[PDB]
From a paper:
The protein mediates passive ion and lipid transport in response to an increase in intracellular [name]+. Fungal TMEM16 structures have defined the general architecture of the family, where subunits, consisting of an N-terminal cytoplasmic domain followed by a membrane-inserted part composed of ten transmembrane helices (α1-10), assemble as homodimers.
To investigate whether equivalent conformational changes, as found for the mutant F518H, would also be observed in activating mutants that are located remote from the α4-α6 interface, we have determined the structure of the mutant [name]. This residue is located on α5 and does not line the predicted pore. Differences in both directions are found for mutations on α5, which constitutes the center of the subunit cavity. On this helix, point mutations of residues Asn 562 and Tyr 563 result in a two-fold decrease of the EC50, revealing two positions where sidechain truncations strongly destabilize the closed state. A dataset of the mutant in detergent, in presence of 2 mM [name]+ and 0.01 mM of the lipid PIP2 (N562ACa), allowed a reconstruction of high quality, showing two populations of the protein obtained after a 3D variability analysis and refinement of the two end states. One population, containing 62% of the classified particles, displays C2 symmetry and was refined to 3.01 Å. The structure of the [name] mutant thus confirms that the rearrangement of the subunit cavity in F518HCa and F518HCaND is not a consequence of the disturbed interface of α-helices 4 and 6, but instead defines a structural transition towards the active state that is adopted upon [name]+-binding. The absence of asymmetric conformations in datasets of F518H obtained under equivalent conditions further emphasizes the gradual stabilization of the active state, which is more pronounced in the case of the mutant of the residue on α4 than observed for [name].
Author numbering:
A (entry chain A), B (entry chain B): 43 to 81, 87 to 149, 187 to 196, 202 to 223, 228 to 427, 445 to 488, 503 to 587, 591 to 640, ...
Write the structure that this text describes.
């Protein structure tokens, strides 16, 4: 318990470049602790005292340590840490590790190189965290946080690209780089058992979840492509789009200006090309695919639960949960009311940043309003404005995202979660809320609040001059925004993931920090961090939200996500294998709070899709016209039809503007202009007021919302009730295990 | 394992009337087995052989048996069964019973009359079920089912009304009859710990759940009475009801006949008294109470979960679940596809009975249509018809309920569930489905399908002549039906529960089957049955459905349920204590599938209340008129108001009937009659067609449904997320137990 003897067999050796064993080679390296001591104000002496005390306690606990001087930096010292068989057995009895038994699985010790390097490293890390050094001080995490130990990490088997020089060593890292984690193997299956063996249950479960997600996205994308091709082949029969394109009918419709000044009365001809591709995106194919996706999200969740149960059986992810140690930062600072006030203050700051991104969205709105005029003066101008606004909003969101990552780390540090699990949960909720708002605010605005509250040309709604939507609807604009944001986020995240660790390693090599041992080689790598796969999970959950929430706009979102996931598996695996220092294996029976987040997103997706179809799409007005306003009571046709829809939907407007300006007279010489609304024509007893057609349409929209929501929720409940969360084969295997044992 | 020696100390004694011990009095009675053997075709010999083998096996296992001849029936033999201390200890080690420890609680045996009579009986019953007698035969349940043993049951402490003759015996039954299970103690608290000690965890958890349910109903009823009194005090300001009552305005409205023949054109005056009491039942008070109940159901569920966790800690309801034995009926008969086909056939039969009760509802509809004419020819006739139909439907439902109980037992016997738990689950789902349909079909019809599809007087909707609703709405009729069904079911169930066991015991005494011992006294009692509190749970769940689903009609449903529960606690406790043979204690950590049923009812209640308020109540039309049709654009009043609502809502009808009969001319000499619909007046370009007012009203109804459902579901989610399911005190106690142990 005191610093008496530390660091035996202190001897420098680098002749063996690829070896995970000690100088004698009898016992392997389970951990590496990196420090430096030769080079003020007594701090060096204090750190030396504390480190010597910790090393003495470690050796007293039974571990074997051997330190070598770095061949490059004379001040760096690497301490290789190995655990004897007796220590491994006793600390595997302390924490109930399941081992192969004659391949049955059971508790602390079984009957049967016996411990894999991953579990050896896990046991050694548990010992390092438990052993005290000193008031009381707990373990190695506090030493690392205090700068006493520069690093502490396990070792990789070998170089990822080259086979290990040692022949008895199975080059698992090389195999995982060759048959995995490499674009050359982009098509092969994932060796989930092997990657679990090499990295741990957390990484294994993440990669299994990603693979299952890709598998389900394959089915969703196939069905979406089927619906999209149905809509594409029915393009020749778009009655309303053909009518818009027709100069005889759509050409004679003079739409009123959108802005007050310097915007001409424009004919509907300029909307022909956009209408052609819009008819594909708002059709019965997209409606059927929205219903199918409502079913498919439930299928995805249920089958992931079944796969998770299967993996819980096969990998034994359920271990006894020992009391989680308090974080060193929390324990350094140690009333309850004050900490509650601090939590409320942190939440206030987070909602302040949410208000900031909302203000950014409002700024984008103002940019659209200001730039439409210059686009018109100088590929219709409205489409160009929409595309440019989408690009600018995407860039602004991406720029804000990194700053929010930094300040979210700052905020979660300012508040004090005692355990790493509490830190992870708080960061999860905070980060997910901000990412949700930032990445979905513009899409939600385009879907639900763009063009909905504008009024008629007389007495328009001012904020100033709220955005008016296109006569065909804003579903095309929403689809463009979704494509831009989703594809750009995917590409940008992949580029950042590939480059940032690689660039950091390259600059580390350039700073000169030839033959070098394994501990040095792995030390010259970027640490993954205390969080781990948090950002990978967050990215995948954001992609899932994009796929599910706005699937009613275009059916190709599952296909885009499928391509993104096929690339994502390989990029994540490659960076984890090559560019990052090895992490201590953990145990995880699920994905964490991300699964409740996905369940909430699944519940919200039904409402979002129903409201998208009802409000942002013109399908309900078209159906209402076809079934009720082409018949004799309100129309002239003998049978149900869609012709005349454009002429009978748009409302007339004689030029009589309220003086509460009248810019139409200054902007043109025309007398009657048509606007996309369902108000009464001029000369009516109640002119410019909502009419029977408007109320019929809105009643149909609300009835569709109610019917779709209730039917889809009922079907989801029935499917969840019908599908058992545990597979029959897994049940049989569990019963066999219980019977044998 | 063979019948060699059975039934030691076979000696008849009845001198001690109140004693739970053997003839020597040293060891107590843990069980009683009743049989008879002296009195064909060799069956008596076969049963004698099997019973002797079972008794020999019982004695070999360590139990002590002593049989006495019945003092009344010479053929009846009672076998008292006692377990020695060693047998109790070994079979308490086999199944991990938690015992007091120095009062901490822990596993099979602790350090400290030691076993309560309840747990002694539970251990002895476990032994009886496990011991084999014989192909292989399992235990005592098969013998009882086969008629070998006439009965097998534990004993009560004493007579419920008289203190036990023995002085060392704590008369727990007498105490539980004096301070509980008695109307004289209708106001006192429930000794939950004492009743759990005497009966078991199942009975204890049921009574605790009932008490908590009553406690929450108290709050719900107080709030409902507040809202009801608000509506009652605002009765003097009901503008529309006062207008209806006014002969100057409501008296001049001539409503068209409802039936085709022999129904007069009737003035709205006859609706004045019903409108007066309807204004109380459809108001903002009832709306606010519906929202409050939406919150209150979530509060109820969350706090019941917290109370359940507290009881799990305090009573140790979580025991190790040994493998449940197969039912004797299932094991007597022992492919999978055939049994699946049988299950589908049984489900088809159940849905057939559901169709039968639906046909009964249709018959009630036909009865109303046929009897309104005779009521009019011979307390307005429509109200009299509604009340009589409610009474008849209630009687028919009650008559069908018992027959369905019998045939549901038959169906669950026809299908083969291997375990009693599977039997309980299947019977639960089947019985709950039928009870739901039977008790809610008429209410759902009145709420959602009565008067909704009738058309206008020209071209009315025929099935024939679907029921037309009152001008004020059918919320009053729904409230009357709810009051009738709920109160009648409560009274009828209480009367049946009180009388049926008591009547059976009385007729058993009358059939002569004076001083008698404890085993005979308890044998002359009605057995509870293998199900137990299944019907009590079902009754309470049906009452909960009545309270929650239709709470938007009248706010006094929680008060009625509160009175019913205050009576129900005492009646259930009294019958369980006095009229029923004692049951073996069980262990239960919750109420079972009834909790998922309650969660489903809670989810459905939001939709049901929103749709009730929107469709069956006139609040939405009144609000729409006030805010949009009393203003100059559609009305003449300068400010928002409600006057003129009756005259401006009802639609006119000139007498021009389609010849697709024309009975109006034969039934009266009038020319213009007003009907409750929002169609255009005669002479309009599109007359007798839905108008802008109708579409505005329906759009408002659907918007209200959407807004209310989404807001209430969001609030329920937030409340469930905010409330932790485990109380802080229970968490502290669990942490203290973990720290000490
Ligand atoms: C819960 C997460 C998602 C929430 C999304 C909320 C979206 C709300 C959208 C909304 O209220 O939009 C306005 C609607 C529909 O009016 P539209 O007929 O689409 O507007 C006409 C536009 N025009 C003048 C160019 C012809 O105007 C109405 O009359 C609709 C009133 C009913 C709203 C129901 C939604 C309430 C949700 C809580
Ligand atoms: C889920 C468990 C509960 C289900 C309850 C379903 C209730 C359906 C009721 C229904 O559709 O009723 C017809 C509605 C109401 O219009 P009303 O104005 O009440 O009908 C005319 C009545 N009058 C001639 C005497 C003036 O007329 C309409 O146009 C309503 C159409 C919108 C129906 C939305 C509900 C769909 C639920 C799945
Ligand atoms: Ca990526
Ligand atoms: Ca990633
Ligand atoms: Ca399921
Ligand atoms: Ca009752
Ligand atoms: Ca009862
Ligand atoms: Ca909760």
């Amino acid at each position: 318990n005191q610093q008496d003897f530390r660091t035996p067999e202190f001897e420098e050796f680098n002749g063996k470049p690829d070896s995970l064993f000690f100088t004698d080679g009898q016992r392997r390296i389970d951990f590496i602790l990196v420090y430096e001591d030769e080079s003020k104000k007594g701090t060096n002496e204090k750190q030396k005292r504390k480190r010597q005390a910790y090393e003495s306690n470690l050796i007293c606990h039974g571990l074997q340590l051997e330190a070598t001087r770095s061949v490059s930096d004379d001040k760096l010292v690497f301490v290789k840490v190995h655990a004897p068989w007796e220590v491994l057995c006793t600390y595997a009895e302390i924490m109930h590790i399941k081992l192969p038994l004659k391949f049955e699985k059971s508790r602390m010790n079984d009957f049967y190189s016996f411990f894999n390097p991953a579990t050896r490293s896990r046991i050694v890390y548990f010992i390092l965290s438990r052993v005290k050094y000193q008031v009381n001080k707990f373990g190695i995490n506090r030493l690392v946080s205090s700068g006493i130990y520069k690093a502490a990490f396990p070792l990789h088997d070998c170089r990822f690209n080259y086979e290990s020089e040692d022949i008895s060593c199975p080059s698992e890292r090389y195999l995982l780089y060759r048959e995995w984690a490499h674009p050359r193997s982009i098509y092969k299956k994932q060796p989930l058992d092997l990657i679990r063996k090499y990295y741990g249950e957390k990484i294994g479960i993440y990669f299994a979840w990603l693979g299952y997600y890709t598998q389900m996205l394959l089915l969703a994308a196939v069905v979406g492509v089927a619906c999209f091709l149905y809509g594409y082949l029915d393009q020749d029969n778009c009655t309303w789009s053909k009518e818009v394109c027709d100069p005889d009918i759509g050409g004679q419709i003079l739409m009123c200006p959108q802005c007050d000044r310097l915007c001409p009365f424009w004919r509907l001809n300029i909307t022909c090309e956009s209408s052609k591709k819009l008819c594909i995106f708002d059709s019965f194919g997209t409606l059927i695919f929205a219903v199918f996706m409502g079913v498919w999200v439930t299928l995805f969740l249920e089958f992931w639960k079944r796969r998770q149960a299967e993996l819980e059986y096969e990998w034994d992810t359920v271990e006894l949960q020992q009391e989680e140690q308090a974080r060193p930062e929390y324990e350094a600072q140690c009333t309850t009311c004050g900490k509650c006030i601090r939590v409320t203050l942190c939440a206030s700051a987070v909602f302040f940043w949410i208000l900031l991104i909302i203000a950014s969205v409002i700024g984008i709105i103002v940019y659209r309003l200001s730039v439409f005029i210059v686009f018109s003066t100088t590929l219709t101008p409205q489409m160009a404005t929409s595309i440019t606004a989408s690009i600018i909003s995407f860039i602004i969101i991406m720029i804000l995202n990194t700053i929010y990552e930094k300040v979210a780390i700052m905020i979660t540090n300012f508040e004090l979660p005692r355990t790493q699990t509490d830190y992870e949960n708080s960061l999860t909720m905070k980060m997910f809320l901000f990412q949700f708002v930032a990445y979905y605010s513009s899409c939600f605005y385009i879907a639900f609040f763009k063009g909905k509250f504008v009024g008629y040309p007389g007495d328009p709604v001012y904020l100033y001059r709220s955005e008016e939507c296109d006569p065909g609807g804003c579903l095309l604009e929403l689809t463009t925004q979704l494509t831009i944001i989703m594809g750009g986020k995917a590409i940008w995240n992949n580029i950042q993931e590939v480059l940032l660790p690689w660039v950091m390693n390259l600059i580390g090599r350039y700073k000169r920090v030839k033959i070098t041992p394994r501990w040095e080689q792995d030390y010259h790598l970027q640490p993954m961090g205390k969080l781990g796969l948090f950002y990978e999970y967050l990215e995948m959950i954001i992609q899932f939200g994009f796929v599910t929430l706005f699937v009613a706009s275009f059916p190709l979102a599952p296909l885009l996500a499928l391509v993104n996931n096929i690339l994502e598996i390989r990029v994540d695996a490659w960076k984890l294998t090559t560019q990052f220092r090895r992490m201590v294996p953990e145990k995880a029976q699920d994905i964490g709070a991300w699964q409740p987040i996905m369940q909430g997103i699944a519940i919200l997706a039904v409402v979002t899709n129903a409201m998208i179809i009802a409000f942002t799409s013109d399908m309900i007005p078209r159906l209402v016209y076809y079934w009720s306003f082409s018949i004799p009571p309100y129309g002239d046709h003998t049978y149900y039809t869609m012709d005349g829809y454009i002429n009978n939907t748009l409302s007339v407007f004689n030029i009589t503007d309220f003086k509460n300006e009248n810019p139409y007279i200054g902007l043109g010489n025309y007398t009657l202009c048509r606007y996309r609304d369902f108000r009464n024509p001029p000369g009516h007893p109640q002119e410019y007021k909502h009419n029977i057609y408007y109320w019929h349409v809105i009643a149909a929209k609300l009835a569709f919302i109610i019917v779709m929501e209730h039917i889809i929720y009922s079907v989801k409940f029935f499917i969840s009730y019908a599908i058992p969360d545990v597979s029959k084969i897994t049940k049989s295997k569990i019963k066999r295990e219980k019977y044998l044992t």
